[PDB]
Assembly symmetry: none
Homo-oligomer: 119 residues x 2
């Protein structure tokens, strides 16, 4: 005959269907920096060059990504960006570390070595 179904049975017999929150999973093949910036941002200007430099000094070893929050509002919004710049240090495994505000080449490297490269 016809079979009667509880939500419980439904999960086992039809579909385990709830859209469970996705766990953080980095897809890059190298550690990376993610720099959320804007053009009306002050420090971001004195920092951009410092970044370009580190992108060479650690070329081959890390990626440095920049995101213009104005050109990508959905993304910035999805990630609760507030202080500018907002800087992300993303390792090949584990949660990103997030630093609200500007940093010096020294402090940056500190995070690049200690966090991106598990030094």
């Amino acid at each position: 005959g016809t079979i009667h179904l509880t939500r419980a049975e439904f999960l086992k017999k039809i579909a385990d269907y709830e859209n469970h929150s996705k766990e953080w999973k980095y897809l890059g093949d190298k550690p990376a920096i993610v720099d959320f910036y804007a053009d009306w941002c002050g420090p971001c200007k004195m920092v951009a060059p410092i970044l370009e430099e580190l992108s060479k000094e650690y070329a081959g070893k890390i990626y440095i990504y920049k995101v213009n929050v104005d050109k990508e509002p959905e993304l910035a919004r999805d990630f609760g960006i507030q202080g500018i710049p907002t800087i992300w240090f993303v390792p090949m495994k584990g949660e990103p570390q997030v630093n609200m505000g500007a940093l010096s080449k020294e402090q940056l490297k500190g995070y690049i070595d200690k966090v991106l490269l598990k030094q």
Copy 2:
């Protein structure tokens, strides 16, 4: 030097972060009809007997399930049940075809032979 990212590139190279990856992964070993019904539902009354009949005529080839929306609110709610009866035809792969409103032995068999098998 530094690489700029769009959101779409972000999804490729950083994290595919949104909850938009969920895939319908049917769990049965045979195609199935899922019938949503309720006691307050008139047309259902004449749809039930048919379904039972079809359960036999097609035994072994398909399962026919019945869900009582009154006793399973979350299920109804979660799937955006608009009215009763709603009927699902669930292939072994691919998304369920959903039809609202009652049906006929002929129409059902139609969906059962074409869509399920």
